[PDB]
Design a protein around this ligand. Sequence first.
Ligand SMILES: [Ca+2]
Length: 119
Amino acid sequence: SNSITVRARGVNGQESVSLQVGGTTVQTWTLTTAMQDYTASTSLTGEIRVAFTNDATGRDVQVDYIVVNGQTRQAENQSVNTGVWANNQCGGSGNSEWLHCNGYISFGNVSLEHHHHHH
Ligand SMILES: [Ca+2]
């Protein structure tokens, strides 16, 4: 199976995030206010999302990165972010660690390719 580690925190420790692969929720965790590693495994190979699902007063999520089969993908390097509050709206910008609104950061398919090298 594929190994995925999510490194994230909540601002008030009430925040819940889900690891979704190809649209399937693989695991769900309540965050602490400290950056912490959370790990899961799956044979699924679809698009990886880290999803904040329980937005409320005082709740926000900050994601550092994920690790996929030993490879770090930085949250700030991801072009899809549907939760960051920017330009006065949810998902206002790519390339952010933040999920303020309910939404997600997409980290790409489990398997990526470059010059016929698969990683
Ligand atoms: Ca490979």
